[PDB]
Amino acid sequence: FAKLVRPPVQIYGIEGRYATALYSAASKQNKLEQVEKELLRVAQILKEPKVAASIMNPYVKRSIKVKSLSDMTAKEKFSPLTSNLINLLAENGRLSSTPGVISAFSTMMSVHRGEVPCSVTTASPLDEATLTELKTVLKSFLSKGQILKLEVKVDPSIMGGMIVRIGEKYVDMSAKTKIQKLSRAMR
Amino acid sequence: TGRIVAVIGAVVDVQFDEGLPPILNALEVQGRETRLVLEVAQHLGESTVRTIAMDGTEGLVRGQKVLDSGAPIKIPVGPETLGRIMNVIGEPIDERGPIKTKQFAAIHAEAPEFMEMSVEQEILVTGIKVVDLLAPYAKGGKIGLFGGAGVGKTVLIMELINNVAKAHGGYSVFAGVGERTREGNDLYHEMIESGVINLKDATSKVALVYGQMNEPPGARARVALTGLTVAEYFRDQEGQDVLLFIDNIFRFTQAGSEVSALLGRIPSAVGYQPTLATDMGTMQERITTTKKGSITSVQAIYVPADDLTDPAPATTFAHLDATTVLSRAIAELGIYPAVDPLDSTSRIMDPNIVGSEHYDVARGVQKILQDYKSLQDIIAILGMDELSEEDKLTVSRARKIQRFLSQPFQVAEVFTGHLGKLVPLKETIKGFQQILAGEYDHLPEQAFYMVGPIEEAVAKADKLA
Amino acid sequence: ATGRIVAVIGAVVDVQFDEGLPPILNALEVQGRETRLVLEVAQHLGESTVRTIAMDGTEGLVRGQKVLDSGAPIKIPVGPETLGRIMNVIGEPIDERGPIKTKQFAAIHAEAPEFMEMSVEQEILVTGIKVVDLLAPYAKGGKIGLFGGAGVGKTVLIMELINNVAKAHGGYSVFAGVGERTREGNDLYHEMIESGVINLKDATSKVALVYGQMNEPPGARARVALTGLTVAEYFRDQEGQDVLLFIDNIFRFTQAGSEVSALLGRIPSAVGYQPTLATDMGTMQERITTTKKGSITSVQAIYVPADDLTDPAPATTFAHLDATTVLSRAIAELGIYPAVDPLDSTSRIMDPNIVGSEHYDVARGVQKILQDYKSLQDIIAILGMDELSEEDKLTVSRARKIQRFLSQPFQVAEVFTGHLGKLVPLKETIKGFQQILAGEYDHLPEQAFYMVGPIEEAVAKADKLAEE
Amino acid sequence: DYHISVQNMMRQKEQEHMIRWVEKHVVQSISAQQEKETIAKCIADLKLLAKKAQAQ
Amino acid sequence: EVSSILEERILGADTSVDLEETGRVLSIGDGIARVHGLRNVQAEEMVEFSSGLKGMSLNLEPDNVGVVVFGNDKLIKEGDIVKRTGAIVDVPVGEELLGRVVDALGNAIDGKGPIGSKTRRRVGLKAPGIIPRISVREPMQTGIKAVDSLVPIGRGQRELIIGDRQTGKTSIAIDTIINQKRFNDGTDEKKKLYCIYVAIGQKRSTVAQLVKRLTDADAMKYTIVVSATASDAAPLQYLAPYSGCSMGEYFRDNGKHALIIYDDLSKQAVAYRQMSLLLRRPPGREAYPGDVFYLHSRLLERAAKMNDAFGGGSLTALPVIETQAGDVSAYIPTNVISITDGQIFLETELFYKGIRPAINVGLSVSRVGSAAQTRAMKQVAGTMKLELAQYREVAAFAQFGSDLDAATQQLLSRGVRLTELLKQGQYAPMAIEEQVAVIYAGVRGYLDKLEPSKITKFENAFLSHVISQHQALLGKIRADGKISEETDAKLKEIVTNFLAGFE
Amino acid sequence: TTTAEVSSILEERILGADTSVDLEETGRVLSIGDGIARVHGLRNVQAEEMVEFSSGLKGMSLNLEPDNVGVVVFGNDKLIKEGDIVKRTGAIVDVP
Ligand SMILES: Nc1ncnc2c1ncn2[C@@H]1O[C@H](COP(=O)(O)OP(=O)(O)OP(=O)(O)O)[C@@H](O)[C@H]1O
Ligand SMILES: Nc1ncnc2c1ncn2[C@@H]1O[C@H](COP(=O)(O)OP(=O)(O)O)[C@@H](O)[C@H]1O
Ligand SMILES: [Mg+2]
Ligand SMILES: [Mg+2]
């Protein structure tokens, strides 16, 4: 077995194996972007009333499903290796997990291009000046030739402080500060 | 170079990229103060190998790089391993500096081929009268040393080492499988006092391989193989009659069972590993007589629940060629060594192997001892005048025999002040034959206590009155 | 938060939520049921799906049925208003007397009292039973065990203890029937109604009842002990009065846990029990303790499967009890009731510094002579009784007299034996057993000591038999 | 020692009562304090910048 | 003052914030949390949840990290954040723990203020190797005549207290703890012994009773009570022996002598079995995991007697095993018997036969042997052991001993008197000189004429007499450590006079 | 998942390089361990047919799973590794 290119995230699960294999195959021949686009457009052609049905139906032969998908992917301009991936999923019966495979590969490619969102959850959003200030400070945290995404949340339970998860760090200056008052309560 | 992907218990899974190491290969974990050696046990697929650890797995992080050594666990071997204590992975643990040898040998080696096997049983003369007479040690065989503490087992081990070194010119290896650290230190210092191991010059006769109880089961599962490799070097590259000690084989079986259980393999009867017979065979078959030399193993045995039919003692007895049992009653009787003359048995105690004369002498000795047991029962019930003159003479001869089985030991000279004796087999046979023939019936009972050859017995009789 | 049922395998129901995932040990209300079905969250299976244990039958449930969350564990109606009222596992009244109108509700799951809250004092609770008050005395505010097999007399013994102690107890009492026969529950309810302990007409009742019987699903039988001990906890903490907590049988809690464990997704432990046996048993037992706020005297009946006390379920309970009373089948077959094993029962207060030198000496002498009798029985088996020496014949006779004098009729057992129930005071028991040890009654037949109270009754029976 | 123990117990009870009032009042007060919440939104942004400078 | 000190405490506490390593809880159940993420976590590393509960990352599976919870699992929800502490579990250590009751993590639970511990020591440190140890020679006086006579215990020896429930194991451990008072409050430093009692799977009321018993005897001032009660989570019960072992290792490394008593190691094994089964680790015999012998082996091997080069300290371990119906062939009893040096065997039959303590001298053994005894105690104990073995050989004929040989009757009488000597009351440990005097009065045939039932009264009266009037001889025996010929003659005179005057 | 659902086989399928390797008569070891070796391929192998490994050991095709073949190795499993090529002998296990 030839060695395969490991994706950066290295997700696990049934979709994990397929996503890792696809990432390794597309890294070879340098077709990551084309495969990613074909995956993001193949999910939409996997949610039609006719297409979504007859693949979750367990009483139709896999051969029928394989062909129904081979001709569909052929007429959908797909003639690289993504057609092979769809055919393999149809043959192995993991068709229901195909959206999960697409999501996993999308996350892998996102980590290849973007970064883990810096989730901030304090309260209702403040002024846009503070938003861009925190975006700039998060960029300074990253500062590795990369650009991070942002996800702002609202939490009434969290008091005047904020909690920020810059990647996998998750600093905490929030209602837990008032929890740390137990030290005075203890001794 | 692989990466750790699972640290479940003592079972560590490493995923490699370029080349998957074969099974039974030593993997060295990077980034740790002390060496952590992983032995490949399975190929799980997706370029992942499941390994058992030879040390604690705390502090291991998913993603730590592990280097494939390229061979099984290789230990330092050679004449310079004598007088040293080394663990399973071969590191010295006696704090006496590195063990500087010329070559290393992998612990996992195939059993000698069919042609290399010897085709003639031969008695390994240990210089001990009781052992060499009633339960002789076959050369390249396995001995089950029954009995625990209070019967001088360690003294017997040291004296066996000394006798084999002096007579056959062969070194000895003591591989303590699951040995207590306190008892390990006590045995080390006792051997130092006995002189079988010397810390000054290179006259030591024992190479110690200690796998303590606090080590993981994988370590205790391979300590026996480490000691066996140390003995194999002497057997092959030097052609010596090596003497291997395993204390004890039951803990080797237990370590194997624990290792198999950690790998999620369905256990066999009485909760033992499925590969009990095969693992025991792979361990024991390397203890044989090749054309270059031989390895003789004296393995201590603990019988769980006092049930000889348990899978571990049964599998062990499947490979034994003789048994020596140290009875506490004999020790209380004052006879050292405390080898029981009746319960000890040898498979080679056959006329075709030891000769007609030796077999006849040993059978006569055992018969006289059994008759003495019956007459002692009668004396316990009835009076000593009830038995006839023949019974009285048999009692006297049997007492003389069972006091002649006692023997001073060179390893005990410093303690008891009595010079040790290395009685040759011919002298033992001749003395016991003459005793059975009634030649020395006039000598007193104490004339045969704690002596070597029968000439020393007659000299001691002359000393008395 | 509304969730949907996705799996109804057995008594284990899997509910999938989308917005708010309930925490573990939360009561879930199943909508669309004619009765009230409560699911207790046991595991978080992931994917916003929780594995739950049903407190009632799962028949009729359909995948996709809506399930609400209470936001809190099972809350029972608690207070002084629950006296004389039988209530279900989830707190619903099952005595057909209307709702249990109370101002307080307490969750059946709560933390055990801390180390600083433990009370080290221990008095002696005289019960009137000769064996109990002599060899394994009970302590006020202490945990009491009634180990026994099937038919040895655990239920009768605990009923006699209720008769002797609960009526004389100034404080309240709680009975928590866990996984037992409904016939026994009805009998106890009617007996306490006619004994004045439970009064339907006015609010002078002194015993609360919590009943989950063997017809209930395993989820219910694994929580009724918690409900009863929660009522006891309220009577102990919120009110400073002393509490009596009678549980019969506590083994069904472990048995119910084992029954649900396999479907909960756990590798079976030894003898097929749940791996969390000791953990859950300790979590339940530590709550039943005497704190500084109040004292709970717990008399728990423990079923011993196959009369094998080495079974894990009864074995783990020994460390949780101060005084233990082991009823043995061999003694019961001899006709000696109660079947308390003199050489197996133990009590923490059995000590000369606590019960006095005389009591300890009498108890130890009784145990020693019974052990010597056990030793001599083997000799009698082969040698023969007539072939024994004259010295050990006296010991055997004294041991027979002591074995028969340990027996005692019970008020709750009048229907079976017909003898009048007796309640021997502690000093009378001590004096009688000391006199028997001294040989003062070696001239009386051993039959005179069988099923009698004080030693005076023994001599009266002896002379009455002599009259005939 | 009677007086000493009584005084110690009273001290402990006063301590627990005071901490109970403090912990039951601070949370609600700061929940009702928007003028302090807006500055608590920036007590850590400078601290975040300092922390990132430490990282970089 | 209270408000002022509270404000001083709160101003002293600094609310620092920093980066961390965090992960989400995929699935929480039965005290086991499957955590997604947490890539850089060491095996057996402490991690804290969002709710404040701590945990130990045991299974480092590829997709998730399995962590055990140090508390109730209801406070952990799916999706909660699990921070990384970054260090292997460690417990506070030092002299400050003396007189305190602490949990498995060292937190004070006696309500006597925080522990002033200045040092922090891990719980999984390796035991000392072959070289650092030395042969056990110094006695560890338990205060029980039977133990100190026939089953001696040295400093650095793992001696097992095995037996069924309600037999006196906890009583033996607690009187061993009490007996060490005479050495600790004295002046000889090399004789002081710091006891560490670890309670595993026992109700808090029992631990409170034990603590009160120790406090009444003034034994808490040198004793640490590590408590992991039945209410506590299984991981705490699993860790408690290791925490106590580390607390004893601190004394061992600093030249001091520590005594560690793992009460109910069987319950720790049960807790570890629960954790392993809930972690889906493969089971074995009696559902115990394969690495259950490892659990107790790597714990008890830490009990050792260091040589002078390493300080000369010691750590004596007294594990307690609760056998079921006296079945020593069970898994955990066999493991612990194999690991330890010897065992002190207690039997219910002997307990109710009047032989209290219930030590069965036939089955109780000590592999360290007489090397862990004083010369006087060894001298009397060899004779007592030989005579008791001879009696136990002929104990079958006691029922029909009247029509027996004169030698057999003499052996029966001597053995009965020695057995009556071995009996001892609870919470009444005896000094070594008192024990050696009693055993001397027994073995030398000064009790054969005396009635067997009157031995206990004679023993108590003789002890009172020798303590009151002949304190000089006892002091000389204690200081010298041997019963010399002059002391032998003095003891002969004293016992003869007291025996003559006893009637 | 399944034995042949591994990432390497999936990569071989999607890349289209499943044409050069002879899956009809040869196979590659997916997982060797516990004395049983799972082989991917050998589509034309027979039940109980003897197959020889790259190292030289011979094995018997015991289990013919839909995606793999369970081969018991007549020898030490140390000599067999993942990725080793297994080829048919075209004969049920026999003996001279
Ligand atoms: N030497 C003794 N003489 C008299 N009674 C004793 C003696 N030793 C212990 N006891 C009593 O025996 C009972 C059991 O003692 P202990 O609690 O030590 O036993 P255990 O087997 O360790 O207990 P458990 O199994 O419940 O943990 C107690 O009532 C105690 O007072
Ligand atoms: N005084 C007594 N104490 C206990 N049991 C008695 C007594 N007298 C008679 N018995 C008999 O003992 C049996 C005990 O029944 P029960 O309490 O239901 O046992 P268990 O509760 O163990 O199933 C009864 O059937 C009864 O006939
Ligand atoms: Mg009943
Ligand atoms: Mg105890």
Residues of D within 8 A of A129 (CB-CB) are: none
Q: What is the DSSP letter of F43?
A: T
Cα(B173)–Cα(B227) distance, rounded to whole angstroms?
Answer: 6
Cβ neighbours of C466 (radius 10 Å): 10
Ligand 1 geometric centre to CA of E101 (Å): 22
| Pairing relationship of beta strands C12-16 and C2-7 according to DSSP bridges | antiparallel
Chain-centroid distance, C-alpha C122: 20
Q: What is the DSSP letter of B295?
A: E
**Whether the CB of C150 sits within 6 Å of ligand 2:** yes
Contacts (Cβ under 8 Å, ≥6 apart) of F49: F60, F61, F88, F89, F90, F91, F92, F93
Cα(E376)–Cα(C411) distance, rounded to whole angstroms?
Answer: 62
| Pairing relationship of beta strands E90-93 and E119-122 according to DSSP bridges | antiparallel
3-state helix, strand, coil in chain C (%, to 5): 40, 20, 40
Cβ neighbours of C119 (radius 10 Å): 17
Helix (H) or strand (E) holding D26: helix D2-31
Q: Which atom of ligand 1 is nearest to the CA of E320?
A: 22
A17, A81, A92 member nearest F15 (Cβ): A81
Tokens 């699972």 belong to residue: B6
**Whether the CB of E267 sits within 6 Å of ligand 1:** no
E60 has which bridge partners?
Answer: E65
| CB C299, CB C207: distance < 8 Å | no
Cα(E161)–Cα(E155) distance, rounded to whole angstroms?
Answer: 16
DSSP reduced 3-state for B255: helix
Put simply, the answer to whether D19 touches E6 (Cβ < 8 Å) is yes
Cα(E191)–Cα(E180) distance, rounded to whole angstroms?
Answer: 9
DSSP reduced 3-state for E273: helix
Q: Give backbone dihedrals phi and psi of E323, rounded to 5 degrees, phi first.
A: -70, 160
Q: In what order do the strands lie in the sheet with B85-86?
A: B85-86, B206-212, B172-179, B241-246, B294-300, B142-146, B322-325, B345-346
Helices (H), E73-230: 145-150, 169-179, 181-184, 204-216
Cα atoms in the Cβ-side hemisphere of radius 13 Å centred on A2: 14
> Min CA distance, B61 vs chain A (Å)?
16
Cα(C398)–Cα(C403) distance, rounded to whole angstroms?
Answer: 9
Cα(E195)–Cα(E192) distance, rounded to whole angstroms?
Answer: 10
Q: Which of C266, C364, C284 is nearest to C320 (CA)?
A: C284
Cα atoms in the Cβ-side hemisphere of radius 13 Å centred on C237: 17
**Which two three-digit tokens encode residue F31?**
């997982």
Cα(E176)–Cα(E171) distance, rounded to whole angstroms?
Answer: 8
DSSP reduced 3-state for D1: coil
Cβ neighbours of F76 (radius 10 Å): 15
| CB C446, CB C401: distance < 8 Å | yes
Q: Chains F, D in contact: 3+ Cβ pairs under 8 A?
A: no
Q: Give backbone dihedrals phi and psi of C253, rounded to 5 degrees, phi first.
A: -60, -50
Ligand 1 geometric centre to CA of E167 (Å): 5
Inter-chain CB pairs, A–E, below 8 Å: 43
| CB B144, CB B317: distance < 8 Å | yes
**Whether the CB of C337 sits within 6 Å of ligand 2:** yes
Chain-centroid distance, C-alpha B90: 20
Cα(E83)–Cα(A171) distance, rounded to whole angstroms?
Answer: 10
Looking at ligand 2, which residue's alpha carbon is closest to its atom 14?
Answer: C153
Ligand 1 geometric centre to CA of D48 (Å): 61
Task: Check the annotation: does B411 bind a ligand.
Answer: no
Nearest-Cα residue of chain A relative to residue E20: A169
Cα(B327)–Cα(B325) distance, rounded to whole angstroms?
Answer: 6
Put simply, the answer to whether F14 touches A84 (Cβ < 8 Å) is yes
Could you tell me where the beta strands, DSSP code E, fall in chain A?
Answer: 114-121, 147-153, 162-166, 171-173
Put simply, the answer to whether A88 touches F14 (Cβ < 8 Å) is yes
Q: Chains D, E in contact: 3+ Cβ pairs under 8 A?
A: yes
Backbone dihedral region for residue A61 (phi beyond 0: left; psi -120 to 50: alpha; all else: beta): beta
Put simply, the answer to whether B182 touches E293 (Cβ < 8 Å) is no
Q: Which of C368, C377, C386 is nearest to C437 (CA)?
A: C368
Put simply, the answer to whether E60 touches B8 (Cβ < 8 Å) is yes
Cα(C458)–Cα(C452) distance, rounded to whole angstroms?
Answer: 6
Put simply, the answer to whether D43 touches A185 (Cβ < 8 Å) is no
Chain-centroid distance, C-alpha F30: 7
F19 at A interface, C-beta within 8 A = no
Q: Round to the nearest angstrom and report the end-to-end CA distance of chain A.
A: 62
Put simply, the answer to whether E63 touches A13 (Cβ < 8 Å) is yes
Residues from D contacting E (CB-CB < 8 Å) are 11, 14-15, 18-19, 22, 44, 47, 51, 55
DSSP string, E221-254: GGEEEEEE-TTS-HHHHHHHHHHHHHHHHHHHHT
Q: Which of C93, C102, C91, C5 is nearest to C49 (CA)?
A: C5
**Whether the CB of E166 sits within 6 Å of ligand 1:** yes
Q: Which residues are within 5 Å of ligand 3 (an ion), measured at CB?
A: C 155
Could you tell me where the beta strands, DSSP code E, fall in B132-204?
Answer: 137-138, 142-146, 172-179
| Pairing relationship of beta strands E223-228 and E194-200 according to DSSP bridges | parallel
How many helices (H) and strands (E) chain E has is answered by 16, 16
E122 has which bridge partners?
Answer: E90
* Cis amide bond preceding B352, omega within 30: no
Taking CA atoms, E462 is separated from C300, E147, E383, E427, in Å, by 47, 21, 21, 19
Q: From E144, E162, E170, give the residue whose CB has the most ligand 1 atoms within 8 Å, as the site to mutate.
A: E170
Cα(B390)–Cα(B441) distance, rounded to whole angstroms?
Answer: 13
Contacts (Cβ under 8 Å, ≥6 apart) of B119: none
E3, E17, E18 member nearest D18 (Cβ): E3
Q: Which residues of E330-368 are buried (b: 16+ CB within 10 A; e: fewer)?
A: bbbbbbbbbbbbbbbbbbbbbbbbbbbbbbbbebbbbbb
> Min CA distance, D9 vs chain A (Å)?
15
Query: What was the elucidation method?
Result: cryo-EM
**Which two three-digit tokens encode residue E274?**
């629960």
Cα(C86)–Cα(C192) distance, rounded to whole angstroms?
Answer: 12
CA angle C303, C305, C307 (to 5 degrees): 95
Cα(C330)–Cα(E310) distance, rounded to whole angstroms?
Answer: 60
Cα(E280)–Cα(B193) distance, rounded to whole angstroms?
Answer: 50
DSSP reduced 3-state for B419: coil
Contacts (Cβ under 8 Å, ≥6 apart) of E43: B7, B57, B58, B59, B60, B61, E57, E58, E60
Q: Which residues are within 5 Å of ligand 4 (an ion), measured at CB?
A: E 170
Cα(A186)–Cα(C276) distance, rounded to whole angstroms?
Answer: 32
Task: Check the annotation: does B119 bind a ligand.
Answer: no
**Whether the CB of C155 sits within 6 Å of ligand 2:** yes
B297 has which bridge partners?
Answer: B142, B244
Cα(A172)–Cα(A159) distance, rounded to whole angstroms?
Answer: 12
Catalytic option among E367, E375, E392, E444: E367
Ligand 3 geometric centre to CA of C184 (Å): 8
Burial of C19 (0-12, 13-18, 19+ CB in 10 A): exposed
Helix (H) or strand (E) holding D21: helix D2-31
**Which two three-digit tokens encode residue C74?**
């099972």
| CB E415, CB E385: distance < 8 Å | no
DSSP reduced 3-state for B404: helix
Contacts (Cβ under 8 Å, ≥6 apart) of E482: E374, E375, E376, E379
Residues of A within 8 A of E80 (CB-CB) are: none
